[PDB]
Write an enzyme that holds these catalytic residues in place. Sequence first.
Site, PDB file in Angstrom:
ATOM      1  N   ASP A 150      10.209  -5.100  14.572  1.00  0.00           N
ATOM      2  CA  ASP A 150       9.238  -6.155  14.288  1.00  0.00           C
ATOM      3  C   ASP A 150       9.941  -7.375  13.705  1.00  0.00           C
ATOM      4  O   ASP A 150      10.740  -7.258  12.768  1.00  0.00           O
ATOM      5  CB  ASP A 150       8.166  -5.701  13.339  1.00  0.00           C
ATOM      6  CG  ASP A 150       7.098  -6.746  13.164  1.00  0.00           C
ATOM      7  OD1 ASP A 150       7.393  -7.791  12.552  1.00  0.00           O
ATOM      8  OD2 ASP A 150       5.974  -6.544  13.666  1.00  0.00           O
ATOM      9  N   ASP A 167      12.438  -5.418   8.684  1.00  0.00           N
ATOM     10  CA  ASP A 167      11.384  -4.426   8.943  1.00  0.00           C
ATOM     11  C   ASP A 167      11.949  -3.116   9.434  1.00  0.00           C
ATOM     12  O   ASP A 167      12.294  -2.977  10.606  1.00  0.00           O
ATOM     13  CB  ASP A 167      10.363  -4.959   9.956  1.00  0.00           C
ATOM     14  CG  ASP A 167       9.004  -4.275   9.838  1.00  0.00           C
ATOM     15  OD1 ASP A 167       8.951  -3.051   9.574  1.00  0.00           O
ATOM     16  OD2 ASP A 167       7.983  -4.975   9.998  1.00  0.00           O
ATOM     17  N   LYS A 211       0.834  -1.208   0.000  1.00  0.00           N
ATOM     18  CA  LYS A 211       0.000   0.000   0.000  1.00  0.00           C
ATOM     19  C   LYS A 211       0.863   1.251   0.000  1.00  0.00           C
ATOM     20  O   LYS A 211       0.715   2.115  -0.868  1.00  0.00           O
ATOM     21  CB  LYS A 211      -0.937   0.013   1.214  1.00  0.00           C
ATOM     22  N   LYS A 262      12.942  -0.697  -3.375  1.00  0.00           N
ATOM     23  CA  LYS A 262      11.644  -0.422  -2.750  1.00  0.00           C
ATOM     24  C   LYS A 262      11.142   0.937  -3.222  1.00  0.00           C
ATOM     25  O   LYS A 262      11.832   1.946  -3.089  1.00  0.00           O
ATOM     26  CB  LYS A 262      11.745  -0.461  -1.227  1.00  0.00           C
ATOM     27  CG  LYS A 262      10.398  -0.543  -0.515  1.00  0.00           C
ATOM     28  CD  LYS A 262      10.513  -0.098   0.941  1.00  0.00           C
ATOM     29  CE  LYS A 262       9.258  -0.436   1.738  1.00  0.00           C
ATOM     30  NZ  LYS A 262       9.087  -1.904   1.964  1.00  0.00           N
TER      31      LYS A 262
END
Length: 257
Positions: free
Chosen positions: A130, A148, A17, A36
Amino acid sequence: QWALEDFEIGRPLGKGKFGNVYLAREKQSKFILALKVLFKAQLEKAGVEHQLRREVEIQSHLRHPNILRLYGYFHDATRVYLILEYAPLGTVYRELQKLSKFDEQRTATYITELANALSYCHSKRVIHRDIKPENLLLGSAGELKIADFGWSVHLCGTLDYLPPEMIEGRMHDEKVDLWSLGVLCYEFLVGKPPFEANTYQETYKRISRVEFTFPDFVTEGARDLISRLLKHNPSQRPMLREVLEHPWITANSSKPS
Ligand SMILES: CCC(=O)Nc1ccc(C(=O)Nc2ccc(Nc3ncc4c(n3)N(C)c3ccc(C)cc3C(=O)N4C)cc2)cc1
């Protein structure tokens, strides 16, 4: 300096998203990596642009074999580009779907690698990462990678690794990472996390009251490490080096300590 035209793009490794992750290759070196792509539209529409920039600064200044490396980054008109280490063997989660559960030797070895990476993180004043299985990657040798640094790319799974102090909205420490380890180690051995339930409400109840059990096949040492880590109150949780030096870990892992 880095620009987009310095990279050949291959397939999407994950669609998300806040952004996407692509296989890529620097054109001069021919060196495989990952790109990314985050959309600025959706970064300002969560007020995180300078929460992201902190994580960029965090991840670029971490050099650890079990932490996913951030080589560099740039921006164009409307997108942020992170140049990232590629992990060829995918998510620990997928591996666990295939094998159902892991054996003691892989589990303990993974827990060693996480504990090292986390100890290092704690040394650099990075008190929480995380580490759900979906956010842990595997390098070409099967070595585990903490990936993460915000804005990831993946039944009651959201609650499942959260410690009581967070679900309860109290103050949370460096001891959160210990609870996570407790949860992972259980999941690796069992194939399910310890507090899984059909409703969020039930999962909360079990996390909150620390209610869980072990299948017959889980050995007393594993049971001891996990029970040591899954403590309601965080100051009772062991230090990361008590994990690295636990009888079950040293007995079963390959990566030394
Ligand atoms: C039947 C189902 C089945 O098993 N089917 C299957 C079908 C296909 C595959 C498969 O080729 N999966 C695969 C393989 C390698 C990677 N590597 C990777 N390297 C670096 C990544 C990153 N992913 N992405 C997406 C991140 C994901 C999460 C996070 C927190 C961070 C990152 C991240 O920042 N980077 C840079 C990714 C995916 C595997 C399985």
